[PDB]
Structures are given as C-alpha cells and as structure tokens.
Amino acid sequence: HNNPFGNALIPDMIADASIQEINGVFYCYATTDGYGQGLKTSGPPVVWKSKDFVHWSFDGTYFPSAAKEKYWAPSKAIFANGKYYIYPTINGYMYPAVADKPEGPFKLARGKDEFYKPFTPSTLLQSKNPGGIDAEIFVDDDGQAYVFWGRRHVAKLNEDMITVDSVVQVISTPRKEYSEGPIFFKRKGIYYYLYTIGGDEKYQYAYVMSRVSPMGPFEAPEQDIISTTNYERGIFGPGHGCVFHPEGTDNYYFAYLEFGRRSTNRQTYVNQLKFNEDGTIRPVELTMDGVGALKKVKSDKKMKIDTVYASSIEVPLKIEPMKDPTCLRTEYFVPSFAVDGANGSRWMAAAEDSINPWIVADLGTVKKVRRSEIYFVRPTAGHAYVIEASMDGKVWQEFAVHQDRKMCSPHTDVLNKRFRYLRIKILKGVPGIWEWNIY
Template sequence: MRFYNPIIPDTIADPSVVEFDGVFYLYGTTDIGTGLGASGVPVVWKSTDFCNWSFEGTIFPDVDWTVAKYWAPGRVLRRMENGRYKYYLYFSASEVASPDPNAPKPDPEQTFVATADSPEGPFVTANGPNIFSGPNKAVPVLDDIDGDPFVDDDGTAYIGWRRRHVAKLNPDWLSIDPSTRHQITTKHGGAYSEGSWIFKRNGIYYYLYTLSSNANYKYAYVMSRESPLGPFEWPEEDLIATTDHEKGIWGPGHGCLFLPQNSDKAIFVYLEYGEGGTTRQVHADWLEFNPDGTIKPVKLSWEGVGPLREVKEAVDIARQGTASASSCRPGRTVTGESDGIKLAREVTYAAQNAVDGWNRTRWWAAEDDPNPWWQMDLKANYEIDRCELAFNFPTFGHAYILEKSVDGENWLKVKVQEERKLCSPHVVEKVGTARFLRVRILEGTPGLWSFKAFI
C-alpha cells in the first residue's frame, strides 16, 4: 500500500488549496525549522493530479524575504476585471525581528492582500508597497492574522480570521466593512483559535477553526443556515479532527476544506506535526457529511486521498536500487503531547529514505560534511529518460552536479547547476545509459526528500 501523506516533499504548514482551469494550486507557510520568528520564501505548489507537485521560483520576487516573513495564506480568489482574470492572495506578514535588542520592534503581524494576473504570480501588494512594517508599509486588510476570504453565490465576499472573527469584505476586496465585524461564540468559550476557513455546501455555511497548538491541534466548526455572518449553530459533535494516537498522526491543524471541481466529495487538507516546531507537513484526507449537513469526524490516514486524476508517469526504477551517501545525520526522537498523552516518534535521515516513495522521510547529510553527495546503484544498466530531484528545504535553492556511471568507477557529468535555483523537483532530461547515479550538492541544504529515475 502506498502512503500519499504527506502530499508534498517539503516542510509546509497552513495549506490553502484552490483549483483553476484543471490545475490544483497549494499555497502555504514555508517552514524552515527555525521557529515562528522567520519563514521561507513564499511559493505556490501546483499539480494536475493531486499527487505530483512542483514549484518554480517565488510568487513574490520583489520582496527581500530575509527581512520579511510570510505565512498562513488564505483561499486565493479570482474574478474577471477588464476582460481578464485577476487573482487575489490574502496572507499574513510582518518583518523579522532584529537580533539587536535596541533595534525598533516590527509592527504586529497583520493580514495583507496582493494581486496578480496569474495564480503563479508575480504578486504585488494591493494597498501600497511590498513593505509590511513601519510608516511606509502597505495598508493591511485586517489588524490580525490568518485572514481567509470566501465569496458567496451572489458575489458578496467575506473574510474570517484568528479567534473566530468574521466580516464582510467591501466590493473592492481590499478592505472590510467594519460595521459587519464580529466574533463567533462557541461551546469552547474563550479558548484560543486560529486557522479559519469558510465554505458553503447545500445552502449551509460552515466556519472551520483550529484549537490549541502543536501536537495538540484540533479542528472544530460551527454552521449557519442563513449567512457567513451567522447566526451560527453549535453541532453536538463539533470536533472533526484530532490526533490519532493509534496511527501516529499528530495535531491536525491550520488548513482548508477543498471541493474538487465536478465532484461531490470534500477533501480536508491540513498540517501535521512533522518533526516538531516549524517542520510541519501537509496531509489530505476525505471529509464526509451526515444527512443533516453536520460533518463526520475525519479519518486521518497515511494513505491519503491519492490521485484525483489519471497519473501519466513513466516507470521510476530508483525505488528498486540501493542508495548510499557521503554521510547521514544521526536519527533522533521527536516528542510531543496531545490530550495529556506523551508522544514520541523516531526519525532517521538514511540515504535509502530518498527512494522509499514516502514524502515523510528524507536523506540529510551530516552538518560537518564538507562535500556531501548521494548515490544510487540501480543494479543494472538502464536507458534513463530523466531524473527528478526533490531537495531538502528547496526554497533556499540548490546548486549541484548530477553524474552517471556504468561501472561505479568512471563518471560522466550529466547536469551542472552552477547557481542556486529555487524549484522542486529539479528535472534533468536525457540522462542516458547508467547503472550508477550520483548527486554532488554544491550549495543549499544537503539532503533529498526524493530521487526518481524514469525510463
């Protein structure tokens, strides 16, 4: 049985999925393992089958993301303006705090909106420059984080955000009508919540939100039969996702509900704890409804939803080979806590992880390795059409050399990527005859989520 969760070979949180013209787009927070004070370069992953995902470059090329941070993008909207589509991206942003304790503190995190002519960007902040702190920053849509918009059947737009707030957006989609702003009460009282998501099905409006944090994340909801602004009903069983202790899936948190086009099924896309802290990963599982419109608790799984369309893929022979590497980081125990229960899982960074077909595992070279490389022995010579390399922390970019050999002693260079390139996977065409394949990493984090070789 194949495990499709996590769905993407990278550390990503707060996923938001949309479908435009037969292509799935996933926007999210790029986790880089350094805590919530910083995030990676914002990108959009895309797929035509919901299984094979890729990105190329950043969606905000005109921002210095070493001083700014971006996270928790909401649902991307589009509408026809002046004869062409315009895309609206709502996201949380601020500036990275200076390590100098005497430096001015950045402004509080807020929700901004940016527009583009394509779902892949480039996006430009709509209410001012691409600056998110200080006197010259763009005007935020909200004075808080986790803004997620929703457009009703009549074209009226709304937005939800942290602590179960909701309001109507003005017709320009760039600001809210403050007279409609209010906070939704729930049976959980004043418990902290975030990660709102509004959707409509069969005339019922649903407002999803997360409770708690880390490995103890849980997903809850309220529903209204009148409006995205309420009044809201509290379902008797309002928790739809929580840690599955038996399966070892922890803290299903900030995500979205996705309704594929031409389908009556719903998909719950969410973050999972990963290796702790900001090393979270994205999962997707089916979500079902009861006849009265209430939501059934989601059955979390490692199998996931699998392909939503036919997967046209050549034969990947890398999974039958044996991998080796210049070094590997030592394994470790990841811990957490959910429902008062202590959690623990073992993580390894072995070379073979890159060809096990699972996006949860990766090869990662030792920190003190001066010349990291990874190698594959396919056991026989093959005529290889292409290789796909999904590197560790791909938004930092990678420079590398891919080599091939028929005997493991004499090597030929197939591809030399001299400068860092931000993409995943890196695709190398027309590899040719080889039994052995070797990747030498020149720049970028030395590791591989996956390596594929197609014949």
C-alpha cells in the first residue's frame, strides 16, 4: 500500500532537471540516475517531452557522440544563431553542444565531435584549469548572454555561444559551503540567483537578488532558504533542479531532485514558486503531489484495472540514510504500483526470477481495448518484451513480440480487440514497471 515517493514528474530516476517550454511543448533535460554505480556512471542523454506536463515520453538519445559517456546536469536548450545550444557536464567537465532542433542530434560546438578522458580541447572553459560543473545560461533583455556554473561562478558568454569571456567573477552569498546547481532568472526587473548548499538529505537552495545586473552586486533577504527538508511530509534534500514558467505567463515553478533511494537513485518533483509584493521569494511549500496539467488538452481516458498479479515481487528495500539518521524509508515493489497513477511507485520482479518474469492486468470483464502504454524501470537501457491477451486467464494469444531493447518510454502496443486479461513477459531489461496504462 504505502508509497513514500508519491507522484514524481517523470517515470524514471532523474536529477538536476532543466525544464522549459519550446513551441508549446514541454521539455525536460536531466541527469539520468538508477544505473547502480553511484557517481561513476550515469544513464545516457535523453530528453523527456509532454504536451500537458502530465504525460511524458522520450525516444532515443538527443546527443549521439555523448551517448556512452557519463552525462550530468544539462542546461536548458538555448535558442541562438538559428540553432539550439546546450551545456552538459560530460565525464566531469562542461562542453558546449549545438543542434538544429531541441530533439537533436546535438554535436560538440567546439572542436571534433568525440570524447576521451579526462577531457578534450572541446571544453566550454578554455583556461589552463577548465574545471567546473552544472552550467546554467541566461540571456538578458539587452541580448547579453551569461554562463553561471558551480561554486558560484559567472562570466559573460560571447554571441558565438562557445567563447566564455576572460573576466570570471564569483558571486558573494551569506551562506558559505560548497555550492552547485545554480539557477538564475529575471522577473519584473529583479535578478534572482539560486544556489545549492549541503548534499544528500541536507541539500538546500538559498538565494540572493540584484536590481543591478546578472553579475551583481547582490543582496540577501532574511528568508533566504527556498527549499529544505520537510520532515512532516517526508521530503528530504530538495536539491539541484530549475525554475521555469510557461511562455507568456507569470506562473513560476520550482523543480527539485529528492534524496530518493540514496546516492544516484533520485527522482524529480515540481511545486509552485510564489513571490511577495516586495519581490522576495516565498519559501516553497514542498509536496510529492506535483502541479497537475499546465495545459488543457484532450486525452483518452484510461481503463480501470480490477486486479493485477505478477510472477514475483522483489523484497522491500530498506533505504539507508547518508547524512540524516532519521531519514528512514522503505520502498515496496507490489504489482498494484504498476497501475496506481504515481510515478514514484513501481512494481519490480524478484532478482532471482530472471527467466521471463511477468505481470497480468485483469480488467474484470471482457472489454474493447485500444492500446497499452508501459513505462518500464530503467527505460534508457531498453526493454525487450512480449505482450499477450486472454479471454479467460489461461489461454493466451501473443499480440506482439519485441526482441530488440528499444530505448524509449512508454512502449506502446496498439491492440483494438476485445479481451479481459493482458500479460507482459519481460525478455530483457530491468524487470519492473512504474506505470502501465490501458486505453
């Protein structure tokens, strides 16, 4: 029954999210988590898209040359010079990348389109020491671009979108710890600089404000902490994310990663960000409920599932804390979590059930089904599966067999037939499902 991870924005483990609206579609560029080796690897660069902010999907990678590298904290995609630029941190270093559209294909914008370790001459910074992470771009009303990065750095960025200015400043803040994940935006003539403090469960965002310029001078309000652990709601370490508003509106949203399952097993959540009359930010009221649909659109209504059952259920995961001894959560893996409408809950088969684990949705009666959409666990590594239908629960007809490990989510099967039961057998990939919708 109990789900401590609520309704995450995306049915995957993602962190460091950059969310924006481009041509009336929402885009979410993020670090893909869940790859099982802490900070030593990541998932590949993928972009999730949504017309409504509720139904999200991705197909393949947007950055072919970077597809096998460790990939962190992409910026927003920035439209300039007829192109889109993005600034991820690849094998620990920042690079400029460019494409004709936000879906890619992106290529390195400086030097050759290849990677080797520790870094190449293609790095964003061209100083002798080119270190730094977590680029954030701002283009001001006068057309001047700026790049912000980790440890409170900022510099002007040239109109070519790849040459950082030689004058680098460090922004003064009243909170002093190691900082990463800068967020910057301008609203009604006030510039806002948001910066992380702490890590793991102690992750917080604080901010400062300027009416002068994106490089300061800045001022700190009394109430300078925007996100922090909320014990009563069970929301821990609300860190590296972004601020966005849909195009043309004054409706601001704060997206944040959460501690999750520890280490790189984070999910991302969104809440409203509100301002006082004096222009100060109201500390965010954090929840795991999301903000619902941000555009009114038509969608097919999903079928009620009467019951679900599975070949096996993984044993509950008791998540060990890192820095907060009171952060004590347990994740269950029951079949009903595949169909509960919450992106923070998942069914997982038992690790020993490694030969065609399966799950059945019973619709209760025979019904006309249009299609199935399956959001598998670790979707960026791909899944091969079989989908079968039955009239009685015993006799099964194969509707479709997918032997390839297609890197996408959701996996959609068009059915248009009457049946009562639907079964998924997983052939390859991680045997779990975040969400399974039948229409």
